[PDB]
Design an enzyme around this catalytic site. Structure first.
Site, short mmCIF file in Angstrom:
data_model
loop_
_atom_site.label_atom_id
_atom_site.label_comp_id
_atom_site.label_asym_id
_atom_site.label_seq_id
_atom_site.Cartn_x
_atom_site.Cartn_y
_atom_site.Cartn_z
N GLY A 1 -4.23 -14.27 17.79
CA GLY A 1 -4.86 -13.18 17.06
C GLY A 1 -5.43 -13.59 15.72
CE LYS A 2 -10.55 -15.98 14.88
NZ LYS A 2 -12.03 -16.17 14.82
N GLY A 3 -6.09 -11.85 11.65
CA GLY A 3 -5.78 -10.76 10.72
C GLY A 3 -6.11 -11.11 9.28
CG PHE B 1 -8.92 -13.38 4.10
CD1 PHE B 1 -10.31 -13.37 4.17
CD2 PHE B 1 -8.29 -12.47 3.26
CE1 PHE B 1 -11.06 -12.46 3.43
CE2 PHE B 1 -9.03 -11.56 2.51
CZ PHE B 1 -10.42 -11.55 2.60
N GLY B 2 -6.27 -14.74 7.91
CA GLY B 2 -5.48 -15.68 8.70
C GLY B 2 -5.78 -15.63 10.19
CB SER B 3 -6.71 -17.67 12.66
OG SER B 3 -6.77 -17.99 14.03
CB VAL B 4 -1.52 -16.09 14.85
CG1 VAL B 4 -0.19 -16.61 15.38
CG2 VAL B 4 -1.29 -15.41 13.51
CG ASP C 1 -2.47 -4.93 6.87
OD1 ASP C 1 -3.24 -3.95 7.02
OD2 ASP C 1 -2.68 -6.03 7.42
C1 LIG Z 1 -3.19 -10.74 14.68
C2 LIG Z 1 -1.86 -11.03 14.00
C3 LIG Z 1 -2.10 -11.95 12.81
C4 LIG Z 1 -1.27 -9.72 13.49
C5 LIG Z 1 -0.87 -11.63 14.97
N1 LIG Z 1 -1.01 -11.54 16.32
C6 LIG Z 1 0.09 -12.17 16.78
C7 LIG Z 1 0.47 -12.39 18.10
C8 LIG Z 1 -0.25 -11.98 19.10
C9 LIG Z 1 0.11 -12.19 20.33
C10 LIG Z 1 1.29 -12.87 20.66
F1 LIG Z 1 1.66 -13.09 22.07
C11 LIG Z 1 2.12 -13.36 19.65
C12 LIG Z 1 1.74 -13.13 18.33
C13 LIG Z 1 2.53 -13.60 17.15
C14 LIG Z 1 3.83 -14.34 17.26
O1 LIG Z 1 4.33 -14.64 18.37
N2 LIG Z 1 4.47 -14.72 16.12
C15 LIG Z 1 3.98 -14.44 14.90
C16 LIG Z 1 2.79 -13.74 14.75
C17 LIG Z 1 2.05 -13.32 15.86
C18 LIG Z 1 0.85 -12.62 15.71
N3 LIG Z 1 0.25 -12.27 14.56
#
Ligand SMILES: CC(C)(C)c1nc2c3ccc(F)cc3c3c(=O)[nH]ccc3c2[nH]1
Length: 286
Positions: A14-16, A18-21, A130
Site C-alpha cells: 500500500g501507499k499512504g 508520503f510513505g509506501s509499504v 489520521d
Molecule cells: C497503506 C498503508 C500505509 C496504510 C498500509 N497498508 C498496509 C498493508 C496492506 C496490506 C497488507 F496485507 C499488509 C499491510 C501492512 C502490514 O502488514 N504491516 C504494516 C503496515 C501495513 C500497511 N500499511
C-alpha cells in the site's frame, strides 16, 4: 538490524501520505526460511520527510500494545521501517471484500480494540491525526491494530492541542472543524475522526456511502477546488453531518454524533467510548 541484501521484495502492499509499504521476505540464511515482513519507506526521500520518518519510527518503537502494529526494526544503506506483516491487510479492504462474514457484533469488537489502542496513544500524549479504516490492519478475524503513524505528533508539555499545516493533501473529510479552521489537533480531534471510523465500519465501505462521497453530495458535486474546505467548514458549523448508515443501531449512531460535537470539550473520552461500546456488545450477546 535488518540487512538490505537479505530483504527480498515480494509485492507492493500500500501507499499512504508520503510513505509506501512492501511485502518482503527477510531471508538472512538465503534458503527461503525467513519470515515475511512489511517494509515502509518514503516514496520520495526529502530531508524534511526523513526527519518526519525518523520521528515516526521512534513513535512506533515506543508503542507496545495488542492493538498497535509491531515494530521489528530498521534498515540502513535510504531509511526503511520494518514492521510485522499482518496477512489480512487493511480493515477498509477486509471489510469491503468480506462483508458477509462480518456482523455488527464483530464491528463493535474492532471498534473496542481501536478505542483501546487510541487510549494507549493518549497515555503517551500522542495524537494520531489520521484515524481511518485504511490505517487499521487486520491480524485475524478477531483482532485489528492501528497500523500506520505517518502523521502522528507528540503534544507539547504545556498545551493540549498541536498546530500543524502540512503541504499537499489532507484527509479533510475525517477532520474535526477546529482542525479545518485552526489546524488544531488533539485527543478530541482524534475522537472526532474515530466517529468517522465508526461511520465507515457500519457502512461496510459501500463506495457511494464514503465520507468524501457523502459530504460532496451535501456540499454539492458542482463544487470548486479551494472552496471545498470552506463549504465543508460551513456545513459542519450548521450541524450538517454524515447520515446514519443503513442498518446501524440508533445507540451506535448516537456514539458517532457525540464524537462529532462542534464543542471540542464535549466529545467523549476514548476510555468512556470503550466502556459504552463494550456495554452494547454485552447487551447484544446475551
Ligand atoms: C497503506 C498503508 C500505509 C496504510 C498500509 N497498508 C498496509 C498493508 C496492506 C496490506 C497488507 F496485507 C499488509 C499491510 C501492512 C502490514 O502488514 N504491516 C504494516 C503496515 C501495513 C500497511 N500499511
Amino acid at each position: 538490524q535488518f540487512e538490505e541484501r537479505h530483504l527480498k521484495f515480494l509485492q507492493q502492499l500500500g501507499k499512504g501520505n508520503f510513505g509506501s509499504v512492501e511485502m518482503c521476505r527477510y531471508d538472512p540464511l538465503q534458503d527461503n526460511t525467513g519470515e515475511v515482513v512489511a517494509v515502509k519507506k518514503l516514496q520520495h526521500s526529502t530531508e524534511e520527510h526523513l526527519r518526519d520518518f525518523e520521528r515516526e519510527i521512534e513513535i512506533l518503537k515506543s508503542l507496545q500494545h495488542d492493538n498497535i502494529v509491531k515494530y521489528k526494526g530498521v534498515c540502513y544503506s535510504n531509511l526503511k521501517l520494518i514492521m510485522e506483516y499482518l496477512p489480512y491487510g487493511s480493515l477498509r479492504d477486509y471489510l469491503q471484500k468480506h462483508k458477509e462474514r462480518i456482523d455488527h457484533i464483530k464491528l463493535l469488537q474492532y471498534t473496542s480494540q481501536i478505542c483501546k489502542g487510541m487510549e494507549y496513544l493518549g497515555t503517551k500524549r500522542y495524537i494520531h491525526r489520521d484515524l481511518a479504516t485504511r490505517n487499521i490492519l487486520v491480524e485475524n478475524e478477531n483482532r485489528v491494530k492501528i497500523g500506520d503513524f505517518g502523521l502522528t505528533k507528540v503534544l507539547p508539555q504545556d498545551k493540549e492541542y498541536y498546530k500543524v499545516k502540512e503541504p499537499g493533501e489532507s484527509p479533510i473529510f475525517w477532520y474535526a472543524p477546529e482542525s479545518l479552521t485552526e489546524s488544531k489537533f488533539s485527543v478530541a480531534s482524534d475522537v472526532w475522526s474515530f466517529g468517522v471510523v465508526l461511520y465507515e465500519l457500519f457502512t461496510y465501505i459501500e463506495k457511494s456511502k464514503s465520507p468524501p462521497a457523502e459530504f460532496m453530495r451535501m456540499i454539492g458535486n458542482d463544487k470548486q477546488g479551494q472552496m471545498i474546505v470552506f463549504h465543508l467548514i460551513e456545513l459542519l458549523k450548521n450541524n450538517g453531518r454524515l447520515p446514519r448508515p443503513d442498518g446501524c443501531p440508533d445507540e451506535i449512531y448516537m456514539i458517532m454524533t457525540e464524537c462529532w460535537n462542534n464543542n471540542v470539550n464535549q466529545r467523549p473520552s476514548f476510555r468512556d467510548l470503550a466502556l459504552r461500546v463494550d456495554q452494547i456488545r454485552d447487551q447484544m450477546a446475551g
